[PDB]
């Protein structure tokens, strides 16, 4: 009668659906990470404190706009807010900083200011920089020098986040003649999309380069790399991060058809993925976005790599204290699909109800996690699981199976790098995975993985290693008792390794909570 | 292989199925999920209604929370005029149903400053007196708000939360009174006229069927509506009341019960048993229960309806942003697709079509998403589970239905063609959720219109006179269906289709499945 | 009844747990029974009783007997079968199968006698000779064999197995036209016993001179199928097909798999054949006996997946040669063959030579009937469907539809009108629980139908009615009358009927769900 446990026992998915129960309350623990974009609505230390209390796990900084000075201050504010809770390490929640790059863009020039484009009219594009400052009703300059190479007669060109739609009729040397499909107001310096085109713009812009160096300087936890189209774009980002940035997680943002097409190579080269639905729905028909989303979430779950669902999840909450019914549904279905994290953009950056937006994602996620059909999900994740000789992988699956057999309150995992805990998360237990680490960055980065509740042990290192291990297990028991995940006498699963250092998790214990 | 998500269709696991979903895999022409559009000022002209039918509208919903009988009579006439403008060629005629959505036990606010269009914008932390003094029913403003629920005090209690306008404005009761409440604006916004008011956690003792509802149901009978969407159904006796009010004259009208509150969810099984179908009325629902639990209730009701073989509609805010914008949000794309994947027979538009700036674009977008989502269903497991979950019965029509759907998967058939007088034989096929469209050929125009409630049914109304020889009459209808599919691009000459008929005239005798190539 | 409680289990494990010895089966037995005819079972009198007890196919073994002897056996089987033809409701078609000798190797005669035996002691010496002067003077010192090439294919260390693999020899000196061996497994050595050489590459023809004569004899006697011995590869099968010629083109070739090479090359052999016999006697000598069940299950599964008949053969009810009841291992084996998915089960010595031939047939009947009810059709049908291509063939669509409908209403039968049998075969391949009553006017189609699990062929002999709808109705009523009389169903039960939209072969597209009148 709690946790949708009745629905969880159903022999079929249809009967599982029929058993879902609005009167079956969820556990306390919410497994899906919440990523909040920070902006004018959410930037103060006092608001950030409430965001953390409301459930923010990751603070996202959008580098499309704003100076390094500004973002540095934002990051400082985030850290001040986070560390205000530091004094009680049992209740302290790590908060990660994510840098989302501007990435390469196609832009128009200066009009004549705005101008009107009428449905059916003719409209030349030129790369002749003499028209850079002189765009108008008959003529439009663009900054992408190689556009004629990458688009054909009959192709479509979108301008100003998709408001405007053109069709290429003539394809010359340094020019294109087009008819205006979707007319409207044409401003200056607008963004241009090219659906279906293989855009050959660099993997990282001049500004992205400076921006990633700033990320390393500022000790960010992860980078959301914009407009990733191929594996080699991920490598160029990785090479720019370099030795100083080598522990920074690269999450690839899939934003166009080519990125969807070449998804498998991108996934293999990345630490995780963001389904950037905003830009993706400009580039592919909006009715196909759910397909791409479900496909990418499935493949990420199969590979055991974090996937973030992004953009317009609770959009109406920019203006309103409650979301639309479509928005509640979108969030629940992203969690049911398998998304590791869900994200807020305008809802937390600019909106009037940023705390309400964060609270709603937390509430829905928690209800949605209880409603997953773990019986089939776990069987399927096993079957598609390769048989290998890696001891930590066998221990992980063993722990998750044990956790289902005894409905443990948690799986406690000692981890330095986070990997042991990620290997458990990939099998999607129902039980929260309390990842105990002394590495503050690991604690921050753990949020990317569904089910991981990171805790940062600050206790001094004991001289006897077995005692230092027992010290950290007990810390995890105290965190669980305090947050109400379980109580004395409940059963939990504990994972440790055979020696200090990373790579040696091979020990699973089923233990009473002291 | 590379159309209709057939690579995904063949996956041995649901996880692998998801992994194979392909944006470059184009759907078939036929869209199975019915689209219900609310008609109002933006869409009630004949001219616009014609374009709604071309864009995909199957049912025209009339919302009796507003408007006079004269107003709704004319909307209905316009719907029929637009629908019959296509009747000259019976092969391309699309039937359109008329649905009456009852007002039911509502609480509504009054007019702002005596105007239905006037608004005040309110601020958080203000004071607002509510009143039942009918002297203020058209003098609602920043300070005084009139409500039509005469028993408001009861029920209500101090500290209770009162919600106005689709839950967007929130008031908290600081003090009770004889016929007045005193409140603080917990959440601000622009307050308008005749807005819906909710009292979650209060026992609203308003009748199941008010005198206005009785007036409206009588009108629906007189106007020959196809279905009634009954508001705020709480228990089986509510459904029986509507059925007895409709009486003999309304005995063929379908009753769709709207589940809009906590008691309706709890008592869902007896409501379903009593009803002809269900609407998941998410607007009120997500105010009466926590918004975060609406998806649970939605998926439970779609599941139980699918298991019962009764139609279920998912309603409210599916493409809400399209009221002001030509393109929906990504959440709205997802919401429509996920309703279809859940198993919803029909999807609905309200303000998007009733009063928005882009009613045609909203109908088109629902058509497009529905069709993409229908190809993405994991039929392999779905059909296995519907088969397993259905009892082993002696009913010959039920055996033929499952046989037909099985055969339709085996040959990836262009259609399942079903002859039906009442619709039932076509409903029995729809229940097993074939990929193929079901072409239901009838001579009963009501059956034609009502069959849109069922996933996958494309009703076609045969106009040809009855032939003296019954076998020739049957064959005439089968060929009409052949002609319709080909004109619509469902299939071409030499494609294989499944054909369902009976062994004698009249309802209840469907027992014959034939697998026939398209001539 | 019919283990229907077990049938509804959501798991194979729970299905087993629900099997119930107090749940009686239906009357219908879907698994064909093939009986080997010999002196125990050859008279018309005894063949009539065999038919009553459930024989569907009479196998003649051409390892022994003259063309004159076998023609007489065939006449007796045909006389036996046609004695029931006075009552069309009760007539059962019985097929005739010819089983070739193939490239066998045989020893000679112990001391000039067909019954004499000698004792071979473990470790004692035995000289094998090809000197035809010892052809009828075999004893414990010298044994003659009829494979003249045995010396150019075995090597010192080689093993040679004699008499159903009960006696084992090891070559300790290889000669010119001789071998010297030491007896590993001793015992009683008799005359004209079978010899095998596992690991040896035997140089004998796929189809010998005598084999050719026998296959031509088959064509002339109008047999229904041929069981072709020791098929090692596809080209062996094409050789049998070639001898059968255009005149015997409708005769079913069942490839008998009896050695390692046959198993290894199974897929090419199955694609060439009309069916398969798991010939377990020779197979369990050519390969280790403990591996035979693997081969049996691989072969039954591959045949079920290809939709081709498969027969399980040899030693199924062995002890019943001397005893009126079987061992527990034999009850288990017949049942498990049926659960594996064998279309037919066979008897050899049990019916040919043994003391209790009617009891062996009756036992196979009783066991098969219980085991068919114990099949987990829920998973079987689901796998067969999934492992089935999406096709444009209307008859296939109709067939899978009819099987689905038969499960939905637990139909008393699926009735199928068929000229060539193909339509009924297409239904059988999806393994319905309901019996498939195949109504044909073609006597060969009715006889060959017995090779497919589930098919109960009935031969309609009434003249073709001018009105086609009435001719179809006539046959459907005939199938209803047969089923009633046999207790497959009663008035008020529901049956599935499959027909075409016109007369002639290849038009099956119509399924109807009808009450039994
Ligand atoms: C949503 N869904 C569906 C739908 C169908 S068809 C009968 O409409 S079967 C099925 C199904 C099975 N399992 N799970 C859990 C699961 C399994 C594999 C991957 C994920 N993400 C989630 C599911 O989530 C799940
Ligand atoms: C023998 N068998 C069968 C047969 C069928 S139907 C197509 O004739 S499905 C199936 C099946 C499935 N699993 N296993 C392994 C198993 C599972 C559960 C209990 C036992 N003893 C053995 C089986 O052993 C097993
Ligand atoms: O998840 P990682 O990075 O592999 O770390 C897991 C490691 O943590 C431990 O449990 C504890 O190690 P430490 O004492 O070095 O922190 C090791 O036995 C184990 O290998
Ligand atoms: O779905 P329903 O209402 O039972 O109608 C199906 C009926 O239609 C038919 O196929 C044709 O009947 P009619 O000629 O009376 O229209 C009957 O054979 C069958 O019983
Ligand atoms: O299995 P086959 O050889 O295709 O025979 C099936 C045929 O039998 C029938 O049901 C009846 O045919 P007949 O009237 O010629 O016997 C046909 O309609 C159908 O095509």
Coordinates of N, CA and C and ligand atoms in Angstrom, one line a residue, chain B residues 397 418-428 441-443 447 466 470-471 473-474 477 500-512, ligand 4:
Chain B
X397 N -18.4 -13.9 -31.9 CA -17.9 -12.6 -32.4 C -16.6 -12.2 -31.8
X418 N -15.0 -4.0 -41.4 CA -16.0 -4.7 -40.5 C -17.3 -4.1 -40.9
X419 N -18.3 -5.0 -41.2 CA -19.7 -4.6 -41.4 C -20.4 -4.6 -40.0
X420 N -21.0 -3.4 -39.6 CA -21.6 -3.3 -38.3 C -22.9 -2.4 -38.4
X421 N -24.0 -2.8 -37.7 CA -25.2 -2.0 -37.6 C -25.1 -1.1 -36.4
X422 N -24.8 -1.7 -35.2 CA -24.6 -1.0 -33.9 C -23.2 -0.5 -33.6
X423 N -22.2 -1.0 -34.3 CA -20.8 -0.6 -34.1 C -20.1 -1.7 -33.3
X424 N -20.8 -2.5 -32.6 CA -20.2 -3.5 -31.7 C -19.1 -4.4 -32.3
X425 N -19.4 -5.0 -33.4 CA -18.4 -5.9 -34.0 C -17.1 -5.1 -34.2
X426 N -17.2 -3.8 -34.6 CA -16.0 -3.0 -34.8 C -15.3 -2.6 -33.5
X427 N -16.1 -2.4 -32.4 CA -15.6 -2.2 -31.1 C -14.8 -3.4 -30.6
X428 N -15.4 -4.6 -30.9 CA -14.7 -5.8 -30.4 C -13.3 -6.0 -31.1
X441 N -18.0 -0.2 -41.8 CA -19.0 0.2 -42.7 C -20.4 0.0 -42.1
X442 N -21.2 1.0 -42.0 CA -22.5 0.9 -41.5 C -23.5 1.8 -42.4
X443 N -24.8 1.5 -42.3 CA -25.8 2.4 -42.8 C -26.5 3.2 -41.8
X447 N -24.3 5.3 -35.4 CA -23.2 4.3 -35.3 C -22.0 4.9 -35.9
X466 N -30.4 -0.8 -50.2 CA -30.3 -2.2 -49.9 C -30.6 -3.0 -51.2
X470 N -29.1 -10.7 -50.2 CA -28.4 -10.2 -49.1 C -26.9 -10.3 -49.3
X471 N -26.4 -11.4 -49.8 CA -25.0 -11.6 -50.2 C -24.5 -10.5 -51.1
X473 N -25.8 -7.5 -51.2 CA -25.8 -6.3 -50.3 C -24.5 -6.2 -49.4
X474 N -24.1 -7.3 -48.8 CA -22.9 -7.5 -48.1 C -21.7 -7.1 -49.0
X477 N -21.3 -3.5 -49.7 CA -20.7 -2.7 -48.6 C -19.2 -2.9 -48.5
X500 N -14.5 -8.6 -42.1 CA -15.4 -9.3 -41.1 C -16.8 -9.1 -41.4
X501 N -17.5 -10.2 -41.5 CA -19.0 -10.2 -41.8 C -19.7 -11.3 -40.9
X502 N -21.0 -11.3 -41.0 CA -21.7 -12.3 -40.3 C -22.4 -13.3 -41.3
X503 N -23.1 -14.3 -40.7 CA -23.7 -15.3 -41.4 C -25.2 -15.1 -41.7
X504 N -25.7 -14.1 -41.1 CA -27.1 -13.7 -41.4 C -27.4 -12.2 -41.1
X505 N -28.4 -11.7 -41.7 CA -28.7 -10.3 -41.4 C -29.0 -10.0 -39.9
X506 N -28.8 -8.7 -39.5 CA -29.0 -8.3 -38.2 C -27.8 -8.4 -37.3
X507 N -27.9 -7.6 -36.1 CA -26.8 -7.5 -35.2 C -26.6 -8.8 -34.4
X508 N -25.3 -9.1 -34.0 CA -25.0 -10.1 -33.1 C -24.4 -11.4 -33.7
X509 N -24.4 -11.4 -35.1 CA -24.0 -12.6 -35.8 C -22.6 -12.6 -36.6
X510 N -21.7 -11.6 -36.2 CA -20.4 -11.6 -36.9 C -19.7 -12.8 -36.5
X511 N -19.3 -13.6 -37.5 CA -18.6 -14.9 -37.3 C -17.6 -15.3 -38.4
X512 N -17.4 -14.4 -39.4 CA -16.7 -14.7 -40.6 C -15.6 -13.7 -40.8
Ligands
LIG4 O1 -21.8 -5.2 -35.0 P1 -23.3 -5.6 -35.2 O2 -24.3 -4.5 -34.8 O3 -23.5 -6.8 -34.4 O4 -23.6 -5.8 -36.7 C1 -22.9 -6.9 -37.4 C2 -23.9 -7.5 -38.4 O5 -23.7 -7.0 -39.7 C3 -23.8 -8.0 -40.7 O6 -22.4 -8.4 -41.0 C4 -24.6 -7.6 -41.9 O7 -25.9 -7.4 -41.4 P2 -27.0 -6.5 -42.1 O8 -27.1 -6.9 -43.5 O9 -28.3 -6.7 -41.3 O10 -26.5 -5.1 -42.0 C5 -24.4 -9.2 -40.0 O11 -24.1 -10.4 -40.6 C6 -23.8 -9.0 -38.6 O12 -24.4 -9.8 -37.6

